[PDB]
Design a binder for this molecule. Sequence first.
Ligand SMILES: *[C@@H]1O[C@H](CO[C@@H]2O[C@@H](C)[C@@H](O)[C@@H](O)[C@@H]2O)[C@@H](O)[C@H](O)[C@H]1NC(C)=O
Ligand SMILES: *[C@@H]1O[C@H](CO)[C@@H](O)[C@H](O)[C@H]1NC(C)=O
Length: 235
Amino acid sequence: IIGGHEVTPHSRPYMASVRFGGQHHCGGFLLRARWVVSAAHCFSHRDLRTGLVVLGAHVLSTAEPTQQVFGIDALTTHPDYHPMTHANDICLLRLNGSAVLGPAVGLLRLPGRRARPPTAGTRCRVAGWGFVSDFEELPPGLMEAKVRVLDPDVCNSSWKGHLTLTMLCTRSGDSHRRGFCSADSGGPLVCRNRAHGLVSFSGLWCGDPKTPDVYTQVSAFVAWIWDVVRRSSPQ
Ligand SMILES: *[C@@H]1O[C@H](CO[C@@H]2O[C@@H](C)[C@@H](O)[C@@H](O)[C@@H]2O)[C@@H](O)[C@H](O)[C@H]1NC(C)=O
Ligand SMILES: *[C@@H]1O[C@H](CO)[C@@H](O)[C@H](O)[C@H]1NC(C)=O
């Protein structure tokens, strides 16, 4: 997270850390006890068995008593995911057990099945354990930046017309660079307590207004998410 601040430990109980080979790779969020939503691009060419999902975390390096670590039983990538464009950059992770909910582990609500994306100007918050600068510097713990939704057409112009309809963007409320960075991918964009966006991609410089922060527009995938969860209910 760029231009953010460290959160009060366990104040975002839905935050998930997706590890590969022991190291934190991407973010995600707890949807249900055995379901985590993350970004499709986080799992490309990766052996699922090398992956772990950490809930109830603050300081990733500490074996915190609130931490709940799980294995991935099944990765369901969006069938129409396009790595070249980041179209449909969403996936579901079925955990090898059910998270025990409490103060440090909770769920984040999805938008309405047919909800519109948030309008330009909507105040949102984005969290992660990704880089805090363009110098590959890791945060002390879970971090969060305050962002505002940016006009999708203005965003599309800055991205030289490569955005899809199911994408939304953000900007900082002020002159300071605020947004996500590498390893924040898959983490949610929370606007009025709903997961409206999911960290997808950005430019060479984190939070740079010339290459605005692009998110997967979550509301367009709610019907798909529930159909995956439901069809995997009997197992
Ligand atoms: C995004 O914008 C596209 C148009 O972009 C413009 O045309 C291309 C060929 C380049 O010249 C580019 O720099 C221009 O900005 C639209 O075709 C596309 O439908 C738009 N996408 C959405 C979701 O609105
Ligand atoms: C879940 O998977 C991880 C990694 O494969 C493993 O260490 C853990 O024991 C598994 N848990 C259960 C309940 O099978």
